[PDB]
Symmetry: C2
Subunit: 309 residues, 2 copies
């Protein structure tokens, strides 16, 4: 009775690991992904998991080819690519499946709401890890857990059943009321380190060595706090600030250029509209001024244009 | 009776040209400057003016060596270096000379007020041109004019006499009530082009080619407008915007990197505290929010620190 037909929407490292565990536990799983080499490798040779190499027979498809329907969609697609993924799955969605989003981003609920009724939406965080070694190949270490929060708890049926299914697969899921808070916490970190490192062409340690890192950090985070306050989402600029500063040492991320800096260096459009830009979007709706975050968003967009030439 | 003993404080291209014309017209002139090679060249071989080379015997000194006193100090020192210049001339100032500042900057009055009574202060603009070819050598073309505005008109004696002296020297000076407005206009241009070009490592034409140049420009200038409004200084974001956009073509400044970008590239501290930073300083005093300009100021300071490593 814990059985589910499950789509993994975005079958990168995390989706692929969740999908293997779910299928091996007895569920019917489809991995859905845009990466042709990955989809083909899974379908032609199976998914390889390295812990020692284990090979699993799995089903993978491009979104536009999916005609099946499911009990559960687990979304790992990045906020910036989420809308297009959901558009391409429009026919899959008519049976009103549970949509569990485990992606980073404050914009995910609003995005998913354009495609499915909001009482079908569950948000999650996870500390499972996974690396994407190559097409159809993940490398996995350790254990983890999942924390889940229904977006409309009063109208979401059978969160228990959902949790059972995940726990039957050994995923260590639990209900919690602080998940969207945890999502916003990660967004606050990312909207400081990604954005400033990109603007400055510097790594995380160089940022932390700035004589004005605290002012730059507070300018972003006090706006995040005011927005979160108006949205009635728990948030602590101080806690995020602690987490930011914990990245600074070389032993941690001091010599790391964050993902947005990498996007910029490779002339790829950044996720700025889903980070600082999204705080600014929400602040406008909530009558909370977000001039810093609005400006930072513009600066990154200008930088993109200049880099593309 | 139009005779004056005049100090030129900051004897670069403009100061040197004004000083020559003033001396040749009959006044006693001291050129005051920090550049040792310039001071020595003037004192040892005279000032050369090229129009055809003409050589003039002039007096030049370092500020710390000046013991004379004057009827008029004409200040050409950049806002950022002004305070130190005025400090070094502290003994020169005890006879309460006229202080005419022809330097760019919204911060000049406040700066000079720390060193002299404010009713002694006159602000000016000029369209005289001059180039500084080398130590003790200027190259000069064309004619010009000077517009002057006493800071406290009701308490400044003999603006007429001042104008006579300058006109006797063929400088084409006039009284006007829109000079501080013209100074703020130039500051609005500079606080957009210098600052954004530096942040983006781009030239003026690249800035003008940005798809969001107008938004970036308005973000700075609407704050300048609000501050100017509170300060009761005439200002038009629209007019400044026109002047900004007039720089964009290659025929004009499209391939030019502005002075702040050059400072940054040479690891020299920029004048940001006297541009965007000064609008923010004044806005704070006037209860006008200036979050964009405050942030931009911080970004430039971070950039400086990173460049200095």
């Amino acid at each position: 009775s814990e059985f589910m037909k499950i789509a993994i929407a975005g079958a990168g490292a995390m989706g692929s690991r969740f999908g293997v565990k779910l299928q091996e536990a007895g569920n019917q799983v489809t991995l859905i992904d845009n990466w042709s080499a990955h989809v083909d490798q899974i379908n032609q040779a199976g998914l390889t998991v390295t812990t020692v190499d284990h090979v699993y027979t799995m089903t993978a498809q491009h979104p536009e080819a999916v005609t099946d329907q499911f009990d559960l969609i687990i979304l790992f697609t990045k906020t910036m690519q989420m809308d297009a993924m959901l558009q391409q799955l429009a026919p899959v969605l008519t049976n009103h499946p549970i949509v569990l989003t485990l992606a980073n981003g404050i914009g995910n609920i609003e995005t998913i709401e354009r495609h499915v009724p909001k009482n079908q939406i569950v948000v999650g965080t996870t500390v499972w890890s996974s690396g994407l070694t190559g097409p159809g190949h993940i490398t996995v270490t350790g254990t983890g857990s999942i924390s889940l929060q229904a977006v409309v708890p009063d109208q979401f049926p059978n969160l228990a059943d959902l949790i059972t299914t995940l726990n039957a697969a050994g995923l260590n899921a639990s209900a919690a009321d602080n998940v969207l808070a945890a999502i916003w916490k990660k967004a606050g970190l990312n909207s400081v380190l990604n954005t400033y490192c990109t603007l400055f062409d510097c790594n995380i340690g160089e940022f932390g060595a700035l004589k004005n890192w605290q002012t730059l950090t507070a300018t972003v985070l006090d706006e995040f706090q005011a927005v979160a306050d108006a949205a009635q989402i728990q948030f602590s600029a101080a806690a995020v600030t602690d987490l930011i500063a914990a990245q600074f040492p070389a032993a941690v991320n001091g010599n790391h250029y964050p993902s947005m800096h990498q996007d910029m260096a490779n002339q790829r459009p950044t996720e700025i509209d889903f980070l600082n830009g999204y705080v600014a979007k929400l602040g406008q709706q909530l009558h909370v001024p977000t001039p810093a975050n609005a400006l930072l968003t513009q600066l990154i967009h200008s930088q993109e244009q200049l880099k593309q030439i």
